[PDB]
Amino acid sequence: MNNPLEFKWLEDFLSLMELGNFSAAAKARFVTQSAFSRRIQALEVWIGVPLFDRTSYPITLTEHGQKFVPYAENLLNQVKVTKEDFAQASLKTDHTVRIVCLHTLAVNLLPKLFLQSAEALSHLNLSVTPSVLGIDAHFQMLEDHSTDLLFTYNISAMRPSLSLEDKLEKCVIHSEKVVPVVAPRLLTIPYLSYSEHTFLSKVVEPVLKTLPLTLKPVFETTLSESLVKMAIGGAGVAWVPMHVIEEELAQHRLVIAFEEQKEWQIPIDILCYRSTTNHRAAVDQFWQEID
């Protein structure tokens, strides 16, 4: 089960039909002339007959290519209509702003931002979900406009893929440190860690061999807010972003470990991304406020 139709071939066929020239069509499809010739060939293998005569000038349709024209458009339009009909299903209303961020930004940063701008945003219905699908999946949704903004850290692992950068705008929301914290009682030490897969594990783990203490891992999760609850409860040392523990540091239920050894801290920037082509007014009024 692996000779499937690839829809890209349908556009390749339409482009060569219209332009009559392998070099021009490849350019219009953003691929090398060889990539493009191979794709047309793969289409012809799949449909089973040659669609183009290469011995005429310019390239023309065969008898079979003529017959195939309505089949190519028919499918291409069905995919388009499918994409368009469901593009609006994400939108409750045209004044709702769809937002994806790290869980700890969904609980600490985003409400603080709306609440501070509550009057200037009072007409907007924010819809806030945490990042859970994988960084590339969420950026694809941003580019497709099924998501309006994306709040991330400026870590390497949360960068948008290189092919996508040109299509996105980003602004900095503020700067921060990831710092180690414990409850007042302090001295081997119980370690409260990020699961090795998630984004913050890669920021913190290199810093940790510089550490002089042996670390007794007793709890790992993916969410900073979970580590914070255990650090409060006296369970170990965790690395957490500062603007997760503001009042906790004030109430002295937590305190920074080796406070004046700033190189066991990691500076990070909170980023907000949008698609340059997403011109929905509700999204624009929101972006104007936090930027």
Among 117, 177, 189, 199, binds a second copy (CB under 8 A): 199
Pair 29, 11: CB distance under 8 Å: yes
- End-to-end CA distance of the chain: give it in Å, rounded: 50
Considering only residues 248 to 287 of the shown chain, the ones binding a second copy according to CB under 8 A are none
Rounded CA separation 6/123 (Å):
43
Identify which of residues 33 and 201 has a Cβ nearer to Br ion in the complex.
201
| Minimum CB distance to a second copy, residue 90 (Å) | 5
- Nearest to residue 13, comparing CAs of 4, 50, 57, 78? 50
CA 11, 17, 19, 25 torsion: positive or negative?
positive
- Report 88-117 residues binding Br ion (CB under 5 A): 92, 96, 102-104
User: Whose CA is closest to 217, among 240, 194, 192?
Assistant: 192
In what helix (H) or strand (E) does residue 229 lie, and over which residues does it extend?
helix 224-232
193 binds Br ion (CB under 5 A): no
Regarding 5 and contact with Br ion (CB under 5 A), the answer is yes
Among 119, 185, 206, 279, which residue sits at the site for a second copy (rule: CB under 8 A)?
206
> In this chain, which stretch among 29-37, 117-125, 197-205, 283-291 interacts with Br ion, using CB under 5 A?
197-205
Q: Is 220 in the site for a second copy (CB under 8 A)?
A: yes
Asked if residue 195 binds a second copy (CB under 8 A), the reply is yes
Cβ contact 231:238 at 8 Å: yes
- 155's contact among a second copy, Br ion, none, with CB below 5 to 8 A by partner kind, is a second copy
Out of 55, 188, 210, 277, point to the residue binding a second copy (CB under 8 A): 55
Q: Measure Cα distances from 103 to 16, 168, 194, 223 in Å.
A: 47, 22, 14, 7
Spell out the residues 6+ positions from residue 215 whose beta carbon is closer than 8 angstroms to its own: 188, 189, 190, 191, 208, 237
In three-state secondary structure terms, 93 is coil
Backbone angles phi, psi at 30, to 5 degrees: 70, 30
Which of 109-117, 171-179, 252-260, 266-274 is the region at the interface with a second copy (rule: CB under 8 A)?
109-117
Window 117 to 176, contacts with a second copy (CB under 8 A): 118, 122, 124-130, 132-137, 139-141, 143-146, 155-159, 161-164
226 contributes a contact to Br ion by CB under 5 A: no
- For the window 8-47, what string marks contact with Br ion as x by the rule CB under 5 A? ------------------------------------x---
Q: Which is nearer to Br ion, 67 or 186 (CB)?
A: 67
Nearest CA-CA partner of 259 in 180, 205, 191: 180
Identify the residue among 148, 226, 256, 283 touching a second copy (CB under 8 A): 226
Q: Whole-angstrom Cα distance, residue 224 to residue 103? A: 8
Q: Which residues sit at the interface with Br ion, rule CB under 5 A?
A: 4-5, 44, 50, 92, 96, 102-104, 127, 131, 135, 138, 152, 198-200, 223-224
